[PDB]
Design a protein around this nucleic acid. Structure first.
Ligand SMILES: [Mg+2]
Ligand SMILES: [Mg+2]
Ligand SMILES: [Mg+2]
Ligand SMILES: [Mg+2]
Ligand SMILES: [Mg+2]
Ligand SMILES: [Mg+2]
Ligand SMILES: [Mg+2]
Ligand SMILES: [Mg+2]
Ligand SMILES: [Mg+2]
Ligand SMILES: [Mg+2]
Ligand SMILES: [Mg+2]
Ligand SMILES: [Mg+2]
Ligand SMILES: [Mg+2]
Ligand SMILES: [Mg+2]
Ligand SMILES: [Mg+2]
Ligand SMILES: [Mg+2]
Ligand SMILES: [Mg+2]
Ligand SMILES: [Mg+2]
Ligand SMILES: [Mg+2]
Ligand SMILES: [Mg+2]
Ligand SMILES: [Mg+2]
Ligand SMILES: [Mg+2]
Ligand SMILES: [Mg+2]
Ligand SMILES: [Mg+2]
Ligand SMILES: [Mg+2]
Ligand SMILES: [Mg+2]
Ligand SMILES: [Mg+2]
Ligand SMILES: [Mg+2]
Ligand SMILES: [Mg+2]
Ligand SMILES: [Mg+2]
Ligand SMILES: [Mg+2]
Ligand SMILES: [Mg+2]
Ligand SMILES: [Mg+2]
Ligand SMILES: [Mg+2]
Ligand SMILES: [Mg+2]
Ligand SMILES: [Mg+2]
Ligand SMILES: [Mg+2]
Ligand SMILES: [Zn+2]
Lengths: 66, 52, 136, 76, 116, 177
RNA sequence: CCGACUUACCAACCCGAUGCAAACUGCGAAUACCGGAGAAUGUUAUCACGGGAGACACACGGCGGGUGCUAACGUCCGUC
RNA sequence: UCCUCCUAAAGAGUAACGGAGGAGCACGAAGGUUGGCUAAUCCUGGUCGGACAUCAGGAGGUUAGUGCAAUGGCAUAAGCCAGCUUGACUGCGAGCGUGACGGCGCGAGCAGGUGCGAAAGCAGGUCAUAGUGAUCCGGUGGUUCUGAAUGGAAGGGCCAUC
RNA sequence: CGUCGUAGUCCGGAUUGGAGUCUGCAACUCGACUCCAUGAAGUCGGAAUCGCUAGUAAUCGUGGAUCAGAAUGCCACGGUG
RNA sequence: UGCCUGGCGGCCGUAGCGCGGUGGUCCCACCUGACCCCAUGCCGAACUCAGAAGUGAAACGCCGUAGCGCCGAUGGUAGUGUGGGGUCUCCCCAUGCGAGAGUAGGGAACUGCCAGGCAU
RNA sequence: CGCGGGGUGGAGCAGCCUGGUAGCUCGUCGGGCUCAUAACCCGAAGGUCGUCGGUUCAAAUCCGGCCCCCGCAACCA
RNA sequence: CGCGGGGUGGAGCAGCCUGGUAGCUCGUCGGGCUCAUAACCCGAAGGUCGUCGGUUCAAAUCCGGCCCCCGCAACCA
């Protein structure tokens, strides 16, 4: 392997919002601070509410009645 | 006719010289090489000489 | 007017067409014309015979053609010597192949077929014969 | 009428054939193509020319996975 | 794919030595085993066949397909070549590059009797 | 290489249970990672070329190779042999760890994430999807980049079929759907 | 904005078919060119050298090119 | 003058005014000895990128490429990258077709070599073929050949050059 | 008094989408006001050129009439200068 | 003496493409580490070296298939002189000479050396 | 009949000098000014380089056919 | 093949005259002003001072290597 041309490559310590500390390699070295990972991502519960299409009949009835 | 002709004389002091050309418009650096001279029957470095 | 979109080269040799031919058999249509002898079919002649067969069939059936004026011949415009190089491109033909079906007909009776092929004999200087598709 | 050229023909093609003796140094074939190659006991020059290193009654054959025509040598 | 690629890679050299007609010392290494021969100038008959599949060679070497076994095979094959009377060969690396097991085995052949 | 450990320990067992292949290694295998960026401005400034190459070298564990123009094209106004494309190709532990970095950092960081296409398999299981920015990556700093680049991760599998590629990726919990 | 349907239209391209050559030969030639092992034949018709020549302006019967008009007591033509 | 093809009778060559396309070289790296790779084309997907820039599977193998106009060659590939190099050295040698000749298109081998490789093997410039032109003399530099009485040196003389 | 510093900025609210009050019987052709957000151009402006000498150009506001309500408007009054 | 497996000669598509099945004793490569000898115009990807946890997915090898490319039938065939002619833009008489075109018909190989597992 | 040139916004010319750079003016659209119009000045838009093909990565640009015109030559008894 | 003149922002013209110094007409734009294209002035941008090297605190100057144009007696095998 070329130890010269490539940047530094070593293990780091990185943290996410959910507190999971990943013992993974990075090119930076120092500790990394993220925002959201795939564990705390709203991909399994937030996607259906992301549709938010609603119902016009439902909104009409809820707003007022005959 | 843009590649000017150059006589290649030895640096070993012997005046047996070759002849090729070079394009001063595209490659202007001097033609530096090792080259053979028959009088000394051994190998030396040639430097380019003007055709004159 | 049958004529190539593009040719391999602008001129070509005058050429040779001797011996026996290969268009012996019928390929596409029911009724055909044989030319045992030898000659040339101009592009004007081929187009004219096609139009005349359309005339006779009243647009019933189909017409088929095998030879093509893919060879632009150079004849010499009159009053020019053998010299001055080769001549000038003038027109297009195909030559006569012994056993060849030239024009084809279908959907109409044998009598109308021989009528139209005799009319091909009366729009061409070439010797004729009446042929149909062969059983195997 | 401006296109009537052809080469000064170089007189290529097989010259000294299989069944003709090779004098010391002689070629077998002069050609611009490697249509007949250097098989057993034969070699090649600089400009697509091939002169055989071995004498005697030459041997014609066809070999190669590409169905190529070579020139080999017999025992004369 | 390695075998076909290597054979195409070696076609020029193998045909070159076959047509030159100098008896060639042939090698073909594999990760687990290796076979080493001495083949005729045209290739129609071998002279000595020595390999890490032989009884004594296999049982006197701890690992069959390794560079140390390749060197031992080189020593053995070149000494048996001397025993039969083999003197002149022209090397054929058989499409590989002259480094590694092939280099060590070839150095062994040089030490044990073949001049290259 | 926790992803390598997971693949060799539990993923292999999961796919054995799924496919029931009588051959132990008959399962298709992912074998490389490719991150591509296409810059037309190479001819305009080889200097920005070098800057983008350095950014790619910083974001990836290995400096990118600069490819040349394969064949000359008039409509794109680039000369044949002039470098116009860049790429990186990785293997093994690099693949596993960078793939974990991708899945656990870039996917949430993708602005306006709506899930990736499940038909991105290049017809035969080669996952192929693109992200428009470089700041969604943890090593490329936001405050130091002047011009934002793009990249599309495309990963070639040995899958005989896109169905088995999707089975592999879904068993590995790939974010398709 | 993705669009729903059909329409005596054209044809890529593959199959069931048609092809083609001065400038293509996945075919193959014949007399023979080149040759290498024989019956007889041939007043030596082969080679080397030395003395001197003509012509560098051959036509018609049996062949394939341009030609030309698939003309000619036609031509550059290669030819018995 | 000099170049790519059929013509011209399956060796050869064969016409001007029998169809089409050109040069008056260039690369000291587009090279060689020695280390590597093998096209073109189309479908699929993707932020850029569109039919085609680039990336990722698949279908064919010389239909790609030749440094040019192009033919014939070329996978071992002269087609596509590069360490050492300047064989893009030099003094000689038995030998074919065109051949009036001139010689050109063609050299096993002697040698000092250099350059290369561990070594086989070589390098005999580059895929060959367009890039070319007579004597004499003179401008020319490396070479004691004669030496207009003797010792020397001069003009006209060999390598390479217009 | 706290914060901002020559940029498309808390300049600028423009174009626009998710929801109310009133008036009007009846807000859509052909009402405003409002909560949220979208967060443009515009960096004093071109040719040529208008109204202003003193409470004067301007600029910050009030009222009126129009009118059920829907103006920057037209007309009176004031702050500053 | 025989199958499988490898190192090389005889044919160089009757060998070569395709589809239906088989091998891990010996055996190939996939494969564990690649800190090493050694490599990348990025990655031990490729090559490779210290090993054999497993392996037959791709590959290699073998049988079946005449579904393709190929071989060539026999009749038949133009043309080459040669002497004869005409219906002389081209066709025919006595022969030597003789292509192709394909077709009814075959072939997936066949063959050899050395050795490893396997048993006389 | 052959040798040259040319065909490029609505119009007239370059860029044809040996290929990548859409240039000049007139003109039309929106203006200011004008008693109104013109002039004047200020803001915009407008092109498959005659055409059909070939070389070239790419052309107007190098090459062949087609259309017209400008020219010349289109001959000697 | 040699000498000499020279390569000055966008152009041409001042400074190479034996080191210590970017000026002139126009070319563009901005500013005053005339209705103003026009004039006068002020300012801003525009210069490896053909290219590299050598002496040096001091370059364009002094010289050497290379390129571009021209004026030159000469011969053009
Ligand atoms: Mg015929
Ligand atoms: Mg033919
Ligand atoms: Mg042909
Ligand atoms: Mg005679
Ligand atoms: Mg004559
Ligand atoms: Mg005749
Ligand atoms: Mg013919
Ligand atoms: Mg004739
Ligand atoms: Mg005559
Ligand atoms: Mg005649
Ligand atoms: Mg005759
Ligand atoms: Mg011939
Ligand atoms: Mg002949
Ligand atoms: Mg090589
Ligand atoms: Mg596409
Ligand atoms: Mg070339
Ligand atoms: Mg080469
Ligand atoms: Mg070359
Ligand atoms: Mg003397
Ligand atoms: Mg004297
Ligand atoms: Mg004297
Ligand atoms: Mg701003
Ligand atoms: Mg702005
Ligand atoms: Mg705001
Ligand atoms: Mg809001
Ligand atoms: Mg109101
Ligand atoms: Mg099987
Ligand atoms: Mg491997
Ligand atoms: Mg398998
Ligand atoms: Mg036959
Ligand atoms: Mg046949
Ligand atoms: Mg078979
Ligand atoms: Mg099969
Ligand atoms: Mg242009
Ligand atoms: Mg220009
Ligand atoms: Mg307006
Ligand atoms: Mg007016
Ligand atoms: Zn988290």
């Amino acid at each position: 392997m070329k130890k010269d041309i490539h940047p530094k490559y070593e293990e780091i310590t990185a943290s996410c919002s959910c507190g999971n500390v990943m013992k993974i390699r990075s090119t930076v070295g120092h500790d990394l601070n993220l925002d959201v990972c795939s564990k705390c991502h709203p991909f399994f519960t937030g996607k259906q509410r992301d549709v938010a299409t609603g119902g016009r009949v439902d909104r009409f009835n809820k707003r007022f009645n005959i | 006719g843009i590649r000017e002709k150059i006589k290649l004389v030895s640096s070993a002091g012997t005046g047996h010289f070759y002849t090729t050309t070079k394009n001063k418009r595209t490659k202007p650096e001097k033609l530096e090489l090792k080259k053979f001279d028959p009088v000394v029957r051994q190998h030396v470095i040639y430097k380019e000489a003007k055709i004159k | 007017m049958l004529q190539p979109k593009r040719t391999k080269f602008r001129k070509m040799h005058k050429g040779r067409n001797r011996g026996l031919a290969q268009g012996t058999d019928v390929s596409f249509g029911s009724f055909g014309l044989k030319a045992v002898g030898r000659g040339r079919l101009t592009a004007r002649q081929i187009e004219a015979a096609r139009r005349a067969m359309t005339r006779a069939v009243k647009r019933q059936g189909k017409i088929w053609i095998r030879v093509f004026p893919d060879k632009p011949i150079t004849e010499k415009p009159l009053a020019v010597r053998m010299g001055k190089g080769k001549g000038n491109v003038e027109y297009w033909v195909a030559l006569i192949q012994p056993g060849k079906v030239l024009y084809e007909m279908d959907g109409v009776p044998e009598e109308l077929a021989r009528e139209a092929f005799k009319l091909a004999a009366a729009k061409l200087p070439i010797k004729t014969t009446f042929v149909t598709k062969t059983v195997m | 009428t401006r296109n009537g050229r052809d080469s000064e023909a170089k007189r290529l093609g097989v010259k000294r054939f299989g069944g003709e003796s090779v004098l010391a140094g002689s070629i077998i074939v002069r050609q611009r193509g490697t249509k007949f190659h250097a098989g057993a006991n034969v070699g090649c020059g600089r400009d697509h020319t091939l002169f055989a290193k071995a004498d005697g009654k030459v041997k014609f054959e066809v070999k190669g996975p590409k169905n190529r025509k070579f020139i080999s040598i017999e025992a004369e | 794919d390695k075998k076909s690629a290597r054979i195409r890679r070696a076609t020029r050299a193998r045909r070159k030595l076959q047509e030159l007609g100098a008896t060639r010392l042939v090698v073909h290494r594999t990760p687990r085993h290796i076979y080493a021969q001495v083949i005729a100038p045209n290739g129609s008959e071998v002279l000595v066949a020595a390999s890490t599949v032989e009884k004594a060679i296999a049982e006197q070497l701890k690992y069959t397909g390794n560079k140390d076994a390749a060197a031992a095979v080189g020593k053995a094959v070149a000494e048996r070549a001397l025993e039969k009377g083999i003197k002149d060969v022209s090397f054929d690396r058989s499409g590989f590059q002259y480094h590694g097991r092939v280099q060590a085995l070839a150095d062994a052949a040089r030490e044990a009797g073949l001049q290259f | 290489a926790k992803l390598h450990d997971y693949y060799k320990d539990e993923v292999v067992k999961k796919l054995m249970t799924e496919f029931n292949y009588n051959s132990v290694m008959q399962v298709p295998r992912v074998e490389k990672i490719t991150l591509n960026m296409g810059v037309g401005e190479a001819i305009a400034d080889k200097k920005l070329l070098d800057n983008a190459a350095a950014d790619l070298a910083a974001i990836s564990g290995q400096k990118p190779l600069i490819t040349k123009a394969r064949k000359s094209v008039a409509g794109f106004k680039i000369r044949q042999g002039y470098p116009i494309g860049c790429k990186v190709t990785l293997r093994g532990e690099r693949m596993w760890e960078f793939f974990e970095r991708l899945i656990t950092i870039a996917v949430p960081r993708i602005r306006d994430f709506r899930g990736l296409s499940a038909k991105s398999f290049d017809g035969r299981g080669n996952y192929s999807m693109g992200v428009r920015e470089q700041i969604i990556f943890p090593e490329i700093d936001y405050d130091k980049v002047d011009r934002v680049r793009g990249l599309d991760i495309t990963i070639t599998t040995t899958a005989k079929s896109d169905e088995e590629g999707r089975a592999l990726l879904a068993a590995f919990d790939f974010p398709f759907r």
